[model samples]
Target chain A: ARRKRTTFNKTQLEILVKSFNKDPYPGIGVREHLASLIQIPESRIQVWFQNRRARQ
Target chain B: ARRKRTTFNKTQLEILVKSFNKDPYPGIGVREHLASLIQIPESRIQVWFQNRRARQ
Candidate 1:
């Protein structure tokens, strides 16, 4: 099956980037909160942070 | 905050490995279904597949 990459909207990107800057390794609670706020799954948030840290 | 690595349970690992063996790149729908079946987030499923592909 073909898998497409997830695209983050402007608001989601803003919050994600800001939170990542503050703490690259955010806890599960923070991730859950961000997931709720961004309307994405917590696992996606965790992977985003993981990829962001890897890129850095 | 510190981050702990996610440890997949035996059943989850079994299903993940079996599904990954069938198709390395599963679609979003497959991932969602797997996430529900395994009781984990779809993002983790994606990452697991991603890492599995990377290691191959």
Candidate 2:
């Protein structure tokens, strides 16, 4: 089944993008922290970093 | 910190591509199965499918 695509709100994107800009790859602990803060899974955060790094 | 990149072998890529060709987005069960077959994390499989779909 196709799951709904996650839409990150302004604040979520702002923090995420900023973190990505500062460190393309973050530690597992940091990822868990971000996931909790953003109310998303750590897997999603990990994927986001992977995709963002691939973009450049 | 950036972790070592996971390199997909021939068999792994073949299976992944075949599944992706059939369905751009696969279900969680399918992803878990693929992850076991590929000896990678389910999250990695999810990201791989996500990036493959975005490529086109």
Candidate 3:
């Protein structure tokens, strides 16, 4: 449903990808930091991190 | 590198999706079984399983 389909914008993704490069396996604190910086939900950022890691 | 780029065919993906639906988080034994059935290597199948769950 809508839960899985939600995604951030391109700039947010580009930012996230760089963040992934820095730490592909980020902890909750890191996730919270990025969510605050990028204005995306922390939960979604967590999912993105999980996805970027598994994508490798 | 070539490792990440290597992916199976459509029929293989369809087959893998159904297999994933059965168990999104398959262990090594299950991964080995699918690898044998589909003629892909166990390691690659492992990555697919990891990627599939995170993708969800």
lDDT of 3 by residue, B1-56 (tens): 02236668998899899988887877767777888888987657777788777877
Global CA lDDT of candidate 3, please? 0.77
Q: How close is candidate 1 to the true structure, as a TM-score?
A: 0.61
TM-score of each: 0.61, 0.55, 0.46
DockQ of each: 0.41, 0.29, 0.02
- Candidate 1 falls in which docking quality class? acceptable
Give me the chain B TM-score of candidate 3. 0.80
DockQ of 3: 0.02
Q: Give the candidate order by descending lDDT.
A: 1, 2, 3
**Which model, 2 or 3, shows the larger TM-score?**
2
Candidate 2 chain B worst ten-residue window by lDDT: B1-10
Choose 1 or 3, whichever is better by DockQ.
Answer: 1
In model 2, which regions exceed 4 Å deviation? A2-26, A29-56
Model 3 misplacement above 4 A = A1-4, B1-56
Tens digits of per-residue lDDT, candidate 1, B1-56, equal 54467789899999999999998889989998998998987777888899999999
The second chain of candidate 1 has a TM-score of 0.89
Please write out the lDDT profile of model 2 over residues B30-50, one tens digit for every residue. 998898888988777887888
